[model samples]
Target: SATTIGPNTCSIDDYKPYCCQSMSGSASLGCVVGVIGSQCGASVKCCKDDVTNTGNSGLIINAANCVA
Candidate 1:
């Protein structure tokens, strides 16, 4: 049920802007992007799959890393 976003198929230009908006206003969903293990400049997309009723903070996605 999860969708895989980037690293190559999707550019950061597309990834960064779109992902945040895509998850906006929705509970239990969030977007995250970052360079994967020495893959300089190349970025990957990962979604936050866990929900904490208390609150969600930080930029990194939780539960699972890039599910690509």
Candidate 2:
């Protein structure tokens, strides 16, 4: 079973998925995808992690971990 983490972004309406500027690229995507695919349920997900706006569009992706 996949252990659900924080951010009730999926359970509620009008909830936005947590986005961050940390790890990105193939490594980040693969890692997140892998983790989410590890079990029957969702353990994690890839969201737009940016500083300015929201939604899927991004000037960057997975920028949560690389906050400066």
Candidate 3:
């Protein structure tokens, strides 16, 4: 998780399935696909893994730890 408060906020309505990112080659499992989280932006990873961003759209309005 991020020590600082991010401008992004996942309103539960913006929830996306973990498998979604995995399949999209954007994010990995157990990773933070949203804001206000601390789940390691999930667990598994694919050939393409970017800690700075979660999704492929670079919607990393919030901060997360995909690399522990």
Query: Which wins on lDDT, candidate 1 or candidate 3?
Result: 1
Across 1-68, the per-residue lDDT of candidate 3 in tens digits comes to 22322223322333332212233554323333333343323322112233435545533322242222
* Strongest candidate by TM-score: 1
- How do the candidates rank by TM-score, highest first? 1, 2, 3
lDDT of 2 at 64: 48
All candidates' lDDT scores?
Answer: 0.35, 0.33, 0.31
Question: Which pairs of residues clash in candidate 3, taking residues 3 or more apart in a chain or in different chains?
Answer: 29-42, 29-43, 30-41, 30-42, 30-43, 31-41, 31-42, 32-41
**Tens digit of lDDT per residue, candidate 1, span 2-56?**
2344455444333331133223344323443433322212233443333333333
**Model 2 weakest 10-residue run by lDDT:** 29-38
Q: Give the TM-score of candidate 1.
A: 0.22
| lDDT tens readout by residue for model 2, 1-68 | 34443444332442233323224334332212222223314224334333333333423334343212
Order of all candidates by lDDT, from best down to worst? Answer: 1, 2, 3
> Which residue runs of candidate 3 sit more than 4 Å off their true CA positions?
1-12, 20-29, 32-68
lDDT leader: 1
Clashes (candidate 1): 0
